Amino acid sequence: TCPFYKKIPGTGFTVDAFQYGVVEGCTAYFLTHFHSDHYAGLSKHFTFPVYCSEITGNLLKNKLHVQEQYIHPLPLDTECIVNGVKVVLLDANHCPGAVMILFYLPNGTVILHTGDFRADPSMERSLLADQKVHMLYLDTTYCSPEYTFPSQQEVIRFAINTAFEAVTLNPHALVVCGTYSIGKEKVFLAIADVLGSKVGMSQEKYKTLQCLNIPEINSLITTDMCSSLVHLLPMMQINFKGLQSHLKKCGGKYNQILAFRPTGWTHSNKFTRIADVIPQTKGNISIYGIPYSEHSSYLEMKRFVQWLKPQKIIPTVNVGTWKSRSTMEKYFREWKLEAGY
Ligand code: NI
């Protein structure tokens, strides 16, 4: 049954609730972003209004084949009425087209649902600064102080220099980047740009990127593998056996593969800096794990919540165990007491 934390009280709205069949009493299904846990259930046979960003719209239409009539794209940063209720969609700084949703209830309550987000100080000068938020539905993916990670800008700097060096030393080396969803495009785009290449990928993936309203994207990607020295592959395929294989397929055009696995957090965040990262090397194949996160670190989460000063917080991630629940409530209380709300 659809859990409480996917329902918005005093409306007939749900959020990211597509895998329970018809939800008794739902008049509009919001989708925060095109990631499969969130969209799970949607298809061409869904016949209820879906509200979402223009980009998430393009992906539902073209990837899932949802019928145009059921997709209601909304512009960001714009006061909009939906079944008699003022709502605003805000950039979640997660993957392309990912939004947070402000709900202005008839009773005067104001609710923010973050979807998936990476909290940033720029959000403190959005439409959120203009009024008080009573309830916060929160992406708690990394709600624990061991979860530190570098800025996106730092991680991209690393990957750019690493790849530029490897390729300037050996012009017959190939860069390969893993992917399994939208998000983290900047990894392979910033690498391609420094190397004077377009990025080459399968037809499935090119289609996915063609929906994303990226400017000058035709200048940056291609389906022609051969013409391109940055390749995207399934993240499953980013291993020694799978890179070896793929290295054969280029037909002796390249002698070395340098590959990147953009992980979230992994325990080596606790000990190692970005400057001091090293790969796994099996001959002429190296694999860098890079901690490129599109979720709030603990400190970023904490700041955003202490700025927002919500009256109540409802977690949407790590809710399946009592230990996780209980641990999160402790940090919420700590934050509230330290900041005096
Ligand atoms: Ni996500």
CSV table of C-alpha atoms and ligand atoms in Angstrom, one decimal:
chain,number,residue,atom,x,y,z
A,1,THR,CA,0.0,0.0,0.0
A,2,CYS,CA,1.1,3.6,-0.9
A,3,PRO,CA,3.1,4.8,2.1
A,4,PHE,CA,2.1,7.9,4.1
A,5,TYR,CA,5.3,9.7,3.1
A,6,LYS,CA,4.2,9.7,-0.6
A,7,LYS,CA,0.8,11.5,0.1
A,8,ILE,CA,0.3,15.1,0.6
A,9,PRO,CA,-2.3,15.8,3.3
A,10,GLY,CA,-5.3,17.9,2.3
A,11,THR,CA,-4.9,17.3,-1.4
A,12,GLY,CA,-5.5,14.4,-3.7
A,13,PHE,CA,-1.8,14.5,-4.6
A,14,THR,CA,0.9,11.9,-4.5
A,15,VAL,CA,4.6,12.1,-5.3
A,16,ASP,CA,6.6,9.4,-6.9
A,17,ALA,CA,3.9,6.9,-6.3
A,18,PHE,CA,3.4,4.9,-9.5
A,19,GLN,CA,3.9,1.2,-8.4
A,20,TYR,CA,0.7,0.6,-6.2
A,21,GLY,CA,-1.9,0.6,-8.9
A,22,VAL,CA,-4.6,3.2,-8.5
A,23,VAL,CA,-4.2,5.0,-5.2
A,24,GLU,CA,-7.6,5.5,-3.6
A,25,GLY,CA,-8.3,9.2,-3.9
A,26,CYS,CA,-5.4,10.5,-6.0
A,27,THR,CA,-6.3,13.1,-8.6
A,28,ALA,CA,-2.7,14.0,-9.8
A,29,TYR,CA,0.5,12.0,-9.6
A,30,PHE,CA,3.7,14.2,-9.3
A,31,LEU,CA,7.0,12.8,-10.6
A,32,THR,CA,10.1,14.6,-9.1
A,33,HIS,CA,12.6,13.0,-11.6
A,34,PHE,CA,13.2,10.3,-14.2
A,35,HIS,CA,14.9,7.6,-12.0
A,36,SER,CA,13.4,4.1,-12.0
A,37,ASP,CA,12.7,3.7,-8.3
A,38,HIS,CA,10.8,7.0,-8.6
A,39,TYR,CA,8.9,6.3,-11.8
A,40,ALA,CA,8.5,2.5,-11.3
A,41,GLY,CA,5.1,1.5,-12.6
A,42,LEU,CA,4.7,4.2,-15.3
A,43,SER,CA,4.1,3.0,-18.9
A,44,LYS,CA,2.1,3.8,-22.1
A,45,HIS,CA,-1.0,2.3,-20.3
A,46,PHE,CA,-1.0,4.9,-17.4
A,47,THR,CA,-4.2,7.0,-17.8
A,48,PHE,CA,-4.0,9.5,-14.9
A,49,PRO,CA,-2.5,13.1,-15.0
A,50,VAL,CA,1.2,13.2,-14.3
A,51,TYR,CA,2.8,16.5,-13.3
A,52,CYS,CA,6.5,17.1,-13.8
A,53,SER,CA,9.2,19.3,-15.4
A,54,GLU,CA,9.4,19.7,-19.2
A,55,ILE,CA,12.5,17.4,-19.3
A,56,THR,CA,10.9,14.6,-17.3
A,57,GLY,CA,8.0,15.1,-19.7
A,58,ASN,CA,10.3,14.5,-22.8
A,59,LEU,CA,11.6,11.3,-21.2
A,60,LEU,CA,8.1,9.9,-20.3
A,61,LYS,CA,6.8,10.6,-23.8
A,62,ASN,CA,9.9,9.3,-25.7
A,63,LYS,CA,11.4,6.6,-23.4
A,64,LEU,CA,8.4,5.2,-21.6
A,65,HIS,CA,5.9,6.1,-24.4
A,66,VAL,CA,3.4,7.7,-22.1
A,67,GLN,CA,0.6,9.4,-24.0
A,68,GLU,CA,0.9,13.1,-24.4
A,69,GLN,CA,-2.5,13.8,-23.0
A,70,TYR,CA,-1.5,12.4,-19.5
A,71,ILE,CA,1.8,14.4,-19.3
A,72,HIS,CA,1.5,17.9,-17.8
A,73,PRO,CA,4.9,19.7,-17.9
A,74,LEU,CA,5.2,22.8,-15.7
A,75,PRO,CA,7.9,25.6,-15.9
A,76,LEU,CA,10.2,26.0,-12.9
A,77,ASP,CA,10.1,29.0,-10.6
A,78,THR,CA,6.5,29.7,-11.5
A,79,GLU,CA,3.3,29.9,-9.4
A,80,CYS,CA,0.9,27.4,-11.0
A,81,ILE,CA,-2.6,26.1,-10.0
A,82,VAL,CA,-3.2,22.3,-10.2
A,83,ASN,CA,-6.7,21.0,-9.2
A,84,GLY,CA,-7.2,24.2,-7.2
A,85,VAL,CA,-3.9,24.2,-5.4
A,86,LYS,CA,-1.0,26.7,-5.8
A,87,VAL,CA,2.3,24.7,-6.5
A,88,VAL,CA,5.8,25.8,-7.5
A,89,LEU,CA,8.5,23.5,-9.0
A,90,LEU,CA,12.1,24.2,-8.1
A,91,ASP,CA,15.5,22.9,-9.4
A,92,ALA,CA,16.5,20.0,-7.1
A,93,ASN,CA,20.2,20.1,-8.3
A,94,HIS,CA,20.0,16.2,-8.7
A,95,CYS,CA,19.8,14.8,-12.3
A,96,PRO,CA,18.4,16.6,-15.4
A,97,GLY,CA,14.8,17.7,-15.0
A,98,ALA,CA,14.7,16.8,-11.3
A,99,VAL,CA,12.5,19.0,-9.2
A,100,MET,CA,11.4,19.9,-5.6
A,101,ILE,CA,7.7,20.8,-5.2
A,102,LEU,CA,6.3,23.5,-3.0
A,103,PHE,CA,2.6,22.9,-2.1
A,104,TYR,CA,0.5,25.9,-0.7
A,105,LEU,CA,-2.4,24.1,1.0
A,106,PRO,CA,-5.9,25.8,1.2
A,107,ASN,CA,-5.6,25.7,5.0
A,108,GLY,CA,-2.4,27.9,4.9
A,109,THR,CA,0.1,25.1,5.4
A,110,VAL,CA,3.2,25.2,3.2
A,111,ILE,CA,4.9,21.8,2.4
A,112,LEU,CA,8.3,21.3,0.5
A,113,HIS,CA,9.0,17.8,-1.0
A,114,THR,CA,12.6,17.7,-2.0
A,115,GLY,CA,12.4,14.7,-4.3
A,116,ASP,CA,16.1,13.6,-4.7
A,117,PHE,CA,18.3,16.7,-4.2
A,118,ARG,CA,21.7,17.9,-3.5
A,119,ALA,CA,21.3,20.8,-1.2
A,120,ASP,CA,23.0,24.0,-2.1
A,121,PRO,CA,23.3,27.6,-0.7
A,122,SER,CA,21.8,29.0,-3.9
A,123,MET,CA,18.5,27.4,-2.8
A,124,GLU,CA,18.4,29.9,0.1
A,125,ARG,CA,17.8,32.7,-2.4
A,126,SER,CA,15.0,30.9,-4.4
A,127,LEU,CA,11.2,31.3,-3.8
A,128,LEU,CA,11.8,29.4,-0.6
A,129,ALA,CA,13.1,32.5,1.1
A,130,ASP,CA,9.7,34.3,0.6
A,131,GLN,CA,7.7,32.3,3.2
A,132,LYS,CA,7.6,29.8,6.0
A,133,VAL,CA,7.5,26.0,5.3
A,134,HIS,CA,5.8,23.9,8.0
A,135,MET,CA,6.5,20.4,6.6
A,136,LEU,CA,9.6,19.2,4.8
A,137,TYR,CA,9.6,15.8,3.0
A,138,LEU,CA,13.4,15.1,2.9
A,139,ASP,CA,15.9,13.1,0.8
A,140,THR,CA,17.8,11.5,3.7
A,141,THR,CA,20.0,9.3,1.5
A,142,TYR,CA,23.2,10.5,3.3
A,143,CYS,CA,21.8,11.6,6.7
A,144,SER,CA,24.9,10.4,8.8
A,145,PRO,CA,28.1,12.4,9.5
A,146,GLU,CA,30.5,9.9,8.0
A,147,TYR,CA,29.1,11.0,4.6
A,148,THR,CA,31.4,13.7,3.4
A,149,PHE,CA,32.3,14.2,-0.2
A,150,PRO,CA,34.0,16.8,-2.4
A,151,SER,CA,32.2,19.4,-4.4
A,152,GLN,CA,31.1,18.5,-8.0
A,153,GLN,CA,33.5,21.1,-9.3
A,154,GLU,CA,36.5,19.4,-7.6
A,155,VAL,CA,35.6,16.0,-8.9
A,156,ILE,CA,35.2,17.3,-12.5
A,157,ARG,CA,38.6,19.1,-12.2
A,158,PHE,CA,40.2,15.8,-11.2
A,159,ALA,CA,38.7,13.8,-14.0
A,160,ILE,CA,39.6,16.5,-16.6
A,161,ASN,CA,43.3,16.6,-15.7
A,162,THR,CA,43.6,12.8,-15.2
A,163,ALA,CA,42.1,12.2,-18.7
A,164,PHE,CA,44.0,15.0,-20.4
A,165,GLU,CA,47.3,13.8,-19.1
A,166,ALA,CA,46.7,10.1,-20.0
A,167,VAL,CA,45.8,11.0,-23.6
A,168,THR,CA,48.5,13.6,-24.1
A,169,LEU,CA,51.0,10.9,-23.0
A,170,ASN,CA,49.4,8.2,-25.2
A,171,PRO,CA,47.2,9.4,-28.1
A,172,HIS,CA,46.1,5.8,-28.8
A,173,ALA,CA,44.4,5.6,-25.3
A,174,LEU,CA,40.6,5.4,-24.9
A,175,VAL,CA,38.5,7.0,-22.2
A,176,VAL,CA,35.4,5.1,-21.1
A,177,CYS,CA,32.7,6.3,-18.7
A,178,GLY,CA,30.1,4.2,-17.0
A,179,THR,CA,26.4,5.2,-16.9
A,180,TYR,CA,23.0,3.5,-15.8
A,181,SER,CA,20.6,6.3,-15.5
A,182,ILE,CA,20.4,10.0,-16.2
A,183,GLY,CA,22.6,12.2,-14.0
A,184,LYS,CA,26.3,12.8,-13.9
A,185,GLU,CA,26.5,13.9,-17.5
A,186,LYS,CA,29.0,16.5,-16.6
A,187,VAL,CA,31.6,13.8,-16.0
A,188,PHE,CA,31.7,12.6,-19.6
A,189,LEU,CA,30.9,16.0,-21.1
A,190,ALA,CA,33.7,17.9,-19.4
A,191,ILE,CA,36.2,15.1,-20.3
A,192,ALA,CA,35.1,15.2,-24.0
A,193,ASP,CA,35.4,18.9,-24.1
A,194,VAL,CA,39.0,19.0,-22.8
A,195,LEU,CA,39.9,16.3,-25.3
A,196,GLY,CA,38.3,17.9,-28.4
A,197,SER,CA,36.0,14.9,-28.9
A,198,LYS,CA,32.3,14.3,-29.0
A,199,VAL,CA,31.1,11.5,-26.7
A,200,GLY,CA,30.1,8.3,-28.4
A,201,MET,CA,27.4,6.0,-27.0
A,202,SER,CA,24.7,3.5,-28.0
A,203,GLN,CA,21.5,4.5,-29.8
A,204,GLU,CA,19.4,4.0,-26.5
A,205,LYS,CA,21.6,6.4,-24.6
A,206,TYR,CA,21.8,9.0,-27.4
A,207,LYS,CA,18.0,9.0,-27.4
A,208,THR,CA,18.0,9.6,-23.6
A,209,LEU,CA,20.4,12.5,-23.9
A,210,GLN,CA,18.5,14.0,-26.8
A,211,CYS,CA,15.5,14.6,-24.5
A,212,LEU,CA,17.4,16.7,-21.9
A,213,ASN,CA,17.4,20.3,-23.4
A,214,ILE,CA,21.1,20.5,-23.1
A,215,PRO,CA,22.3,23.5,-25.3
A,216,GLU,CA,24.4,22.7,-28.4
A,217,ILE,CA,24.0,18.9,-27.6
A,218,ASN,CA,24.2,18.0,-31.3
A,219,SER,CA,27.8,19.4,-31.2
A,220,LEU,CA,28.7,17.3,-28.1
A,221,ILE,CA,27.4,13.8,-28.8
A,222,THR,CA,27.3,11.1,-31.5
A,223,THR,CA,26.3,7.5,-32.2
A,224,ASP,CA,29.5,7.1,-34.3
A,225,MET,CA,31.8,5.3,-31.9
A,226,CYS,CA,34.7,5.3,-34.3
A,227,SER,CA,34.9,9.1,-34.6
A,228,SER,CA,35.1,9.7,-30.9
A,229,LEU,CA,37.7,9.2,-28.1
A,230,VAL,CA,35.3,9.3,-25.1
A,231,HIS,CA,32.9,6.3,-25.0
A,232,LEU,CA,29.9,5.7,-22.7
A,233,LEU,CA,29.1,2.2,-21.6
A,234,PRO,CA,26.7,0.4,-19.2
A,235,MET,CA,28.1,0.7,-15.7
A,236,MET,CA,27.8,-3.2,-15.5
A,237,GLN,CA,30.4,-3.3,-18.3
A,238,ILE,CA,33.0,-1.2,-16.4
A,239,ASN,CA,35.3,-4.0,-15.2
A,240,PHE,CA,38.5,-5.7,-16.6
A,241,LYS,CA,36.8,-8.5,-18.5
A,242,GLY,CA,34.2,-6.0,-20.0
A,243,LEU,CA,36.8,-3.4,-20.9
A,244,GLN,CA,39.1,-5.9,-22.5
A,245,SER,CA,36.2,-7.2,-24.5
A,246,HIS,CA,35.2,-3.6,-25.6
A,247,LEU,CA,38.9,-2.9,-26.4
A,248,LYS,CA,38.9,-5.7,-29.0
A,249,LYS,CA,35.8,-4.1,-30.6
A,250,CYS,CA,37.5,-0.9,-31.6
A,251,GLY,CA,39.7,-2.9,-34.0
A,252,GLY,CA,43.2,-2.0,-32.9
A,253,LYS,CA,42.5,1.8,-32.9
A,254,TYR,CA,43.4,2.1,-29.2
A,255,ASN,CA,46.0,0.3,-27.0
A,256,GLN,CA,44.9,1.6,-23.5
A,257,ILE,CA,41.5,2.3,-21.7
A,258,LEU,CA,41.2,4.8,-18.9
A,259,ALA,CA,37.8,4.4,-17.3
A,260,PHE,CA,35.8,6.2,-14.7
A,261,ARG,CA,33.1,4.7,-12.3
A,262,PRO,CA,31.2,7.7,-10.9
A,263,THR,CA,30.2,6.1,-7.6
A,264,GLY,CA,28.2,7.9,-4.8
A,265,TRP,CA,29.9,7.4,-1.5
A,266,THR,CA,32.3,4.5,-0.9
A,267,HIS,CA,34.2,4.0,2.5
A,268,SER,CA,37.5,5.4,1.1
A,269,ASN,CA,35.8,8.9,1.5
A,270,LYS,CA,36.6,8.4,5.2
A,271,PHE,CA,40.4,8.3,4.6
A,272,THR,CA,41.4,9.6,1.2
A,273,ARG,CA,41.3,13.1,-0.5
A,274,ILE,CA,40.3,13.7,-4.2
A,275,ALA,CA,43.9,14.9,-4.9
A,276,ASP,CA,45.2,11.5,-3.6
A,277,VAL,CA,43.0,9.1,-5.6
A,278,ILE,CA,44.4,6.0,-7.4
A,279,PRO,CA,43.0,3.4,-9.8
A,280,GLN,CA,42.9,-0.4,-10.2
A,281,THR,CA,45.3,-1.3,-12.9
A,282,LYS,CA,45.2,-4.6,-14.9
A,283,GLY,CA,47.8,-4.0,-17.6
A,284,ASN,CA,46.6,-1.4,-20.2
A,285,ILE,CA,43.2,-1.0,-18.3
A,286,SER,CA,42.8,1.5,-15.4
A,287,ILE,CA,39.5,2.1,-13.4
A,288,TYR,CA,39.0,5.2,-11.3
A,289,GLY,CA,36.1,5.3,-8.8
A,290,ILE,CA,35.2,9.0,-8.5
A,291,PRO,CA,32.8,10.2,-5.8
A,292,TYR,CA,30.5,12.4,-7.9
A,293,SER,CA,27.3,12.8,-5.8
A,294,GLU,CA,24.0,14.1,-6.8
A,295,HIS,CA,22.7,13.7,-3.2
A,296,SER,CA,23.3,16.2,-0.3
A,297,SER,CA,26.3,15.4,1.9
A,298,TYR,CA,25.5,15.3,5.7
A,299,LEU,CA,26.8,18.9,6.1
A,300,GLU,CA,24.9,20.3,3.1
A,301,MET,CA,21.7,18.6,4.3
A,302,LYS,CA,22.2,20.0,7.7
A,303,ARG,CA,22.8,23.5,6.6
A,304,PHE,CA,19.7,23.6,4.3
A,305,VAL,CA,17.5,22.2,7.1
A,306,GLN,CA,18.8,24.7,9.7
A,307,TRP,CA,18.2,27.5,7.3
A,308,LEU,CA,14.7,26.3,6.4
A,309,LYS,CA,13.6,25.8,10.1
A,310,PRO,CA,10.8,23.5,9.2
A,311,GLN,CA,8.2,22.5,11.9
A,312,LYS,CA,8.1,18.9,10.9
A,313,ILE,CA,10.5,16.7,8.9
A,314,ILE,CA,9.3,13.5,7.1
A,315,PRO,CA,12.1,11.2,5.6
A,316,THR,CA,11.7,9.7,2.2
A,317,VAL,CA,14.9,7.6,2.1
A,318,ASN,CA,16.3,4.9,4.5
A,319,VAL,CA,12.8,4.6,6.1
A,320,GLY,CA,12.6,0.8,5.9
A,321,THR,CA,14.3,0.0,9.3
A,322,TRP,CA,13.7,1.2,12.8
A,323,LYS,CA,17.4,1.8,13.4
A,324,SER,CA,17.6,4.1,10.3
A,325,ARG,CA,14.4,5.9,11.4
A,326,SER,CA,15.6,6.3,14.9
A,327,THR,CA,19.0,7.5,14.0
A,328,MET,CA,17.6,10.2,11.7
A,329,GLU,CA,15.2,11.5,14.3
A,330,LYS,CA,18.3,12.0,16.6
A,331,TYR,CA,20.0,14.2,14.0
A,332,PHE,CA,16.9,16.2,13.3
A,333,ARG,CA,16.6,16.9,17.1
A,334,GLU,CA,20.3,17.8,17.3
A,335,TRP,CA,19.9,20.3,14.4
A,336,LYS,CA,16.8,21.8,15.8
A,337,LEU,CA,18.3,22.4,19.3
A,338,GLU,CA,21.6,23.8,17.9
A,339,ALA,CA,19.7,26.3,15.8
A,340,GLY,CA,16.9,27.2,18.1
A,341,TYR,CA,13.7,26.4,16.0
B,1,NI,NI,17.4,9.9,-8.0
